[PDB]
């Protein structure tokens, strides 16, 4: 096996920056080195083959060089849609082997979240459970503090967070916090609130509702 060593394993850069990703092969692979781009949720896409040949349709800001054991992928003006994991692949020797991947993250300016809250649906309540969903939409950086307050009492142990990958156009994140109670527990309190603290907010924002008012 030829071991393909990629560096760095992750990488953050601003839009417009030049970024460089290198691949080292444990043995000489001549020029049979391909670079692949994998956007979240999708299959890998061919960027460059034969170390330096751009595939038809790939933007000219991508460029590949190197020979023997040391190869480089260059993006000359990083664009938001270039957020992805990049893989090198040698294909001169069986088994084909990939590098471990470089995840390229985009630095952008601070962006405040828009905060939305959803009361539980009657359909779910009829089944004995109450999920309350708090939505933070299109914000940056990723670090965010979401706290559930139930009748002004901070909750723990009954919520879960999910964050999207950076948006391919504006590099922001979105986040969901989901508070799940049994119907009996849910019916013991009135005010359901999520309080959000984020770099882009000058003071924490609270979105709330009273049970049964919707």
């Amino acid at each position: 096996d030829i071991q393909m060593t990629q560096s760095p394993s992750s990488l953050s850069a601003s839009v417009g920056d030049r970024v460089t990703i290198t691949c080292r092969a444990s043995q000489e692979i001549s020029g049979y080195l391909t670079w692949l781009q994998q956007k979240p949720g999708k299959a890998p896409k061919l960027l460059i083959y034969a170390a330096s040949t751009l595939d038809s349709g790939v933007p000219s800001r991508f460029s590949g060089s190197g020979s023997g054991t040391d190869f480089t992928l260059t993006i000359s003006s990083l664009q938001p849609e270039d957020f992805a994991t990049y893989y090198c692949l040698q294909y001169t020797n069986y088994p084909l082997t990939f590098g471990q991947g470089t995840k390229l993250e985009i630095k952008r300016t601070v962006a405040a979240p828009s905060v939305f809250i959803f009361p539980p649906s009657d359909e779910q309540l009829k089944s004995g459970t109450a999920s309350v969903v708090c939505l933070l939409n299109n914000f940056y950086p990723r670090e965010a503090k979401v706290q559930w307050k139930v009748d002004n009492a901070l909750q723990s142990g009954n919520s879960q967070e999910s964050v999207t990958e950076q948006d391919s156009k504006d590099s922001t994140y979105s986040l969901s916090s989901t508070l799940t109670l049994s119907k009996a527990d849910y019916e013991k309190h009135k005010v359901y609130a999520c309080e959000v603290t984020h770099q882009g907010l000058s003071s924490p924002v609270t979105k709330s509702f009273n049970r049964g008012e919707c």
């Binding site: 294909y91 809250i117 939505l135």
Partner: protein, 223 residues
């Protein structure tokens, strides 16, 4: 136009044999073959093997004893069998078009992949609940609405809005494990807040492993 389409079972019980097909169109099976690659969730890529235009096969020797690769040119479909599967074989399985000679073994176009989950457990379809828009999900001229897709196994579920006509502003969150061992996710979309009484919003949930297809209308609330 070159197309490759994988098809798999979704859930496979341990020690059984995984059976995958890749159906192709747009190129000559006398000049191209396919590679098989897999990707465990969150991890890198691992080449499994390749079948060449003339029928020659090359294996990843680590998996060779369990792997069987073949072609049926009348069906335009390639196949991969992986026997005695374990949780180590849970992954997205891709096929990719193969070309080359005896010195280079290139690959260009991939299919979109199929997620194989190896588990003793039985499949379970999701419950879909509305996340209703209201003043509490409205900022100015923008309102947010969504679908909570709850208590399914295994991954994945796909979510579209209004049969694919609503794509702008959709966020389908990555699934999260619950302490019950079942997954849960939300799909949200921001729409114009003046449209809540004139445009119907329906999320379309498809959980293929359980052959479950749900369309849920999301109606507003009044708070």
């Amino acid at each position: 136009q070159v197309q490759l389409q994988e098809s798999g079972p979704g859930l496979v019980k341990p020690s059984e044999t995984l059976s995958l097909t890749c159906t192709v169109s747009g190129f000559s099976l006398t000049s191209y073959g396919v590679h098989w690659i897999r990707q465990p969730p969150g991890k890198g890529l691992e080449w499994i093997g390749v079948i060449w235009a003339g029928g020659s096969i090359n294996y990843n020797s680590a998996l060779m004893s369990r792997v069987t690769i073949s072609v049926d040119t009348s069906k335009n479909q390639f196949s991969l069998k992986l026997s005695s599967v374990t949780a180590a074989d849970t992954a997205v399985y891709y096929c990719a078009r193969a070309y080359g000679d005896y010195v280079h073994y290139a690959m260009d176009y991939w299919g979109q992949g199929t997620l194989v989950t190896v588990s003793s457990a039985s499949t379970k379809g999701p419950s879909v609940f509305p996340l209703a828009p209201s003043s509490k999900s409205t900022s100015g001229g923008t309102a947010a609405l969504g679908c909570l897709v709850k208590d399914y196994f295994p991954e994945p579920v796909t979510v579209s809005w209004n049969s694919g006509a609503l794509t702008s502003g959709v966020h389908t969150f990555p699934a999260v494990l619950q302490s019950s061992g079942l997954y849960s996710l939300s799909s949200v979309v921001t729409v114009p807040s003046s449209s809540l009484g004139t445009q119907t919003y329906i999320c379309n949930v498809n959980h293929k492993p359980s052959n479950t297809k749900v369309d849920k209308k999301v109606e507003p609330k009044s708070c």
